[PDB]
Enzyme design. Sequence first.
Site, mmCIF file in Angstrom:
data_model
loop_
_atom_site.group_PDB
_atom_site.id
_atom_site.type_symbol
_atom_site.label_atom_id
_atom_site.label_comp_id
_atom_site.label_asym_id
_atom_site.label_seq_id
_atom_site.Cartn_x
_atom_site.Cartn_y
_atom_site.Cartn_z
ATOM 1 N N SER A 72 0.848 -1.184 0.000
ATOM 2 C CA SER A 72 0.000 0.000 0.000
ATOM 3 C C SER A 72 0.885 1.236 0.000
ATOM 4 C CB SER A 72 -0.939 0.023 1.212
ATOM 5 O OG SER A 72 -1.580 1.281 1.333
ATOM 6 N N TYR A 113 -0.787 -0.253 10.440
ATOM 7 C CA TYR A 113 -1.084 -0.732 9.093
ATOM 8 C C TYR A 113 -0.015 -0.284 8.103
ATOM 9 C CZ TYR A 113 -3.448 -1.343 4.622
ATOM 10 O OH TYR A 113 -3.763 -1.699 3.331
#
Lengths: 243, 242
Positions: free
Chosen positions: B139, B152
């Site tokens: 990501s 995350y």
Amino acid sequence: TNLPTALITGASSGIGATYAERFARRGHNLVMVARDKVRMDVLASRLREETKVTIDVIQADLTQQKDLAEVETRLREDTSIGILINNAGMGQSGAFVQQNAQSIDRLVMLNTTAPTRLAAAVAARFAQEGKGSIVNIGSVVGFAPELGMTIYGATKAFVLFLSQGLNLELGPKGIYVQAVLPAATPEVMDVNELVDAALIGFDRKELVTIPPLHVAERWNELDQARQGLMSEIRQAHAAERYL
Amino acid sequence: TNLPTALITGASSGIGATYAERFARRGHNLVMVARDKVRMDVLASRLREETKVTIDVIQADLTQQKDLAEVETRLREDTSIGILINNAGMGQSGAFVQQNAQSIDRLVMLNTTAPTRLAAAVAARFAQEGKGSIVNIGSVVGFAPELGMTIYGATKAFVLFLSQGLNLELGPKGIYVQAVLPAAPEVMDVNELVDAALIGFDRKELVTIPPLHVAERWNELDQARQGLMSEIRQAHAAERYL
């Protein structure tokens, strides 16, 4: 002024042991956490006689859920602990194809899951008191996938990002979050040199401390390049080069 | 034979499901791995009818040691699997002070420990055969600790480094390791994202960032990274630290 107790993981040798010695001489009480109890007791006995500070020794295998939760509870309930040193000497054994599932579990747990959970244990209390320090021991290997320590370097890149995120989240609450990035430790650095340099950055409240980095600007350039990449992120559509 | 089987984690929705749809239409047999069996069965039934490929559906909670070890075993022993898509839709729920030990365990396990262990399951066999592909779904949050998704984004920075290291280690043995970096309020269509990621997959692109408008920014960032390592002098601390 209150000198807060410091909890230090991997306190049995290396960077952890040197941190314990420095903080004890500075007047801080210690909570030493390590798997090797024998070396902790030897070090604690010497530091008690030399520095007269209080030192609590906790034997803990942080790959165990039981042991890690006990250290978490101590950080949550001991209001005298104002410093957490997230240190782990756990490295990678050779190449990636030589890693088994169990060594990967332990490597990620000790270098990633355990430091994050320990920071979470003190984060809520540090926000209440409006003060506190979290020192995460990363590594410059997190910048160098060319060195062949893939999993280890990946966990260190994790630790650096965690420190940057924790700074932006906990900084406004009065919490100091430092990332210390030692060299891969062909003459390497003395552990006394490394920790003394890391403490110079700690007293300046430097956010990212890289003792082996010759040009400090190199870090800011990397950070600028990182932020420069985010300035070109357009989430509405894929770039034309993929159409 | 011919087109190698692809194993896909998180294949029940989102990126994983779209990857399953694309590879099935291309002619690849599939091994779909996800916690949500109901959505996997619906998708698999349709893809079998539309594409006539073989699809094996494995229900697995990859936060369980038992389930994860089973997927590892399948990756080691099924020699027809030549593609691994390390995908996980697992995100972070809000701020860091709201995270508990259990959610941290699951977040790191699903986004870091499980992809690393799955790659290790195929690494030895892929080196034996001299071929194979590992696609890690990262990501762009791994570039942005400013977004407030600390854990995350940290797991995604892990995933990017893992891909870069695995490329340098497994590349010379004939293994392709790709890092795909989706974006985190108009967002991108999931079909655009996977179609863009597959365009890089066919080019054997090492780092594919669809939402990146200027591709040069990545090369500059990588150059800046290597520039920092060129000034690492390990013999003594920098002079600015006395």
